[PDB]
Amino acid sequence: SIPRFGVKTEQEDVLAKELEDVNKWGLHVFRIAELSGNRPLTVIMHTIFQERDLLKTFKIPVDTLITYLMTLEDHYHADVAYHNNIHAADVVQSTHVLLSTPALEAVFTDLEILAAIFASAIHDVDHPGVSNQFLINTNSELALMYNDSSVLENHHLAVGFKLLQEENCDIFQNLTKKQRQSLRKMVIDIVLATDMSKHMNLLADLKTMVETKKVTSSGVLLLDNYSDRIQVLQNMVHCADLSNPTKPLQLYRQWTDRIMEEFFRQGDRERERGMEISPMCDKHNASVEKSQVGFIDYIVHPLWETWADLVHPDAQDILDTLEDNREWYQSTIPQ
Template sequence: MKLEGHHKGPHRYRGRGGSKVQSKIWRRGAISYDSSDQTALYIRMLDVRVRSQVGFEPERRSSHPYLRIDFRTLHTRLGYGSSSDGSGTERRVHRLLSFQRYLHSSRLLRGISQQIPLHILDEDYNGQAQCMLEKVGNWNFDIFLFDRLTNGNSLVTLTFHLLNKYGLVELFQLDMVKLWRFLVMVQEDYHNDNPYHNAVHAADVTQAMYCFLQEPMLAKSLTSYDILLGLLAAATHDLGHPGVNQPFLIKTDHYLATLYRNTSVLENHHWKSAVGLLRETRLFSHLPAEDSLNMERELGSLILATDISRQNDYLSRFRMHLDKENLCLSNASHRHFVLQMALKCADICNPCRPWELSKQWSERVTEEFFQQGDIEKKHKLEVSPLCDREANTIGNIQIGFMSYVVEPLFAEWARFSDSRLSQTMLGHMGLNKASWGGLQQEQTAVSEEAGPSATDAENAVAGGSSSKEIPQGSLES
């Protein structure tokens, strides 16, 4: 197998008709890019600039102070995701090493013979992690435990395992060195300072996507191409998420909002970041150019479907198909639409997990909301709905989210795939909703036992009444 090294200048490869095509490959810093692909280059350059500096100067000038601060640096300054003993130091990833050199430089493999066969990729997880992978299709799969067992490499390990499990590496003749580099770079480009939108969330969504791909309705209809696309979309669907939502980026005049004209800003960013990594690693460079471009477009179509602001559009279309019973999975466009709905379900399936897992995710996503609210307060901005930690609780946010977003979607998914898994998910969601309701009642009882406040007493004397409304707001990601 030919290992990919550093290269400069002209690069020749054979096109679809067998003729030699010449394309200049340039390197800028740690980036390989095709001179004809300015969009992918721009995204990669912006991302590297943000991650490599304490503060950054945006491409488009703006007077807003937030734009000169790295998201993760700001979180650290506010005291989140860091510790005084330095335990939060980022893990060093050897991005530009070939896979063989990466293996040989690993502490786990020091002292082992240099003749390491590439099939070690199939055996690189053992013990408890291997036992968990044997049950990767179980809905109660504990991704938090798996991430600890893989030393923080759950996304790389899980995604590679699933691609190999389906035989996609061999079927699509994927270079394992390029594939491994791609997955490592994907995992690295998630901001693990984010409480929720990080690589563990991506791994969790990928595992959920695998569960949906195994559903009888899909397992007998999807092609290998569909499965490859679905798994890659799940792994990259939140790539480079900054830990704040789209309205925040728009109201702070962020360069991403301008770049994508305030439309599906985060989802476009995730998609273009994924395309940038695919092209940087040249994972599909052996495929005809037209096929590779089609794959990138369809990957984008899946990722863009996760925009929560378009939830009702997709749900209405899904409901209409089910009412008319006209979904035909032998039709490629219908299969793609079902993949979109499966990814949407996988993305917000946390309330449908067992309580022990669902509660952890609820706490994480709420903390990310609250961190955004803290940033908004710090910079004298209007606090976004659900982001004020003094006015909201985890329970009321989750009950609203389940009632208005999750339940309608999973009810229609159960109509489409009336399986044991669908009933299990609906059952968990009902129990979790009741659990949050119980916790809310306990908190209310404790507040009442604490006695009325001075303001409440004044209102009572004046004959008035005091009530505190729970804001519902928007749940945009």
């Protein structure tokens, strides 16, 4: 074998070429997971941080960043089919694309950008692949600690920040206390808003925002106060989290297979424990296609429609894709 010396390996080259689509909706995220040796979150976060010059801006040592990223990625569960490091990388990358929408040019500070991306990276870390309700009903220690209230989402935040304390992991070591307090508050506000129980209120407020919407010649959005800025950042990451149906069908179905696998597993555990089987978790009584059409009509389309308005016309193709995917699942309901 010939030692490599200063030139990319061929796999690393194939990976680098795939990462050329980091700014595009529909990145081959599963290919990247494989090509990186199951390091999609590390490699995608690193690319995005370099692209946005965040290492220089926040004086983040490169070895510290990579060590933290690997450590964070190591705390997503390989055995969990959907809420794993690939989902995390996908939400990071989707948020990264949404941040660069023309309607949002020059709106956000570098610290706000850092908050949205870091929030996306950590938002599901240490997910056990079961719901808050399952954790509550079993009297889990986690549910006890967090008083049955946004149990997992509190946990995701606690773990994401806690991991900064591991050896050479404090990527925020050079931020001032003011910078850290601000970042921290934003990240917390964003991740706690990913609790699906908060969706309706979150959407309600986004609608209210679109109504009173203000722009400036060129048509870029105007956002004066923390309340408006964080609202947009919350809904942005929430859209990224619910972005699977807006991706090309080939990607969307892979996400659907994975979440169903994860749900059915929870249902098998509920059944064997003699518990009521949670909605959509019963593999003996599933209607996958009906359920996706319902997911889209009642949750995903309403959200994205409202986002497309806020940033009109930036999100038109994303919305078109969503509607094509809705039609595909509709036509697949076996009747």
